A = this chain, B = another copy of it.
Amino acid sequence: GGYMLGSAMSRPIIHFGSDYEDRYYRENMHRYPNQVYYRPMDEYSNQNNFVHNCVNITIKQHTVTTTKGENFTETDVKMMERVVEQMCITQYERESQAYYQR
């Protein structure tokens, strides 16, 4: 299966229990993508499988792309997964709406 790239979306504001992470994310959220890769909606899609795949592929592709670099720390990996998951849910909402209203 290939994957579509969604349109940019605004980067999620995310609040963390760790004061360090909470501030780090505010100051560094521009380091992460504002688009996700996803499998187009079909008869087999649901939020669980859509987001599962979107998260896996978006992170994997970003690593493949960022081997113009790029020095993601452990903290960046954690920040990256949280933001990607939220954006993938937003993408699911976009695609599923378009797919049923059609």
Q: Is the CB of A13 within 8 A of B77?
A: no
Q: Is the CB of A14 within 8 A of B48?
A: no
Interface residues in A30-85 by Cβ distance below 8 A to B read: 47-48, 51-52, 55-56, 59-60, 77, 80-82, 84-85
Q: How large is the interface on A (under 10, 10 to 19, 20 to 34, 35 or more residues)?
A: 20 to 34
* B residues in contact with A94, CB < 8 Å: none
* B residues in contact with A52, CB < 8 Å: 13, 15, 17, 22
A95 and B57 CA atoms in complex are apart in Å by 34
- Which listed residue (B17, B22, B84) contacts A17, Cβ 8 A? B84
Q: Is the CB of B84 within 8 A of A48?
A: no
- Which listed residue (B15, B16, B60, B85) contacts A16, Cβ 8 A? B85
Q: How far is the CB of A11 from chain B (nearest CB, A)?
A: 12
8 more CB-based (< 8 A) A-B contacts, given A14-B85, A15-B85, A16-B85:
A13-B47, A13-B48, A13-B51, A13-B52, A15-B55, A15-B56, A17-B52, A22-B52
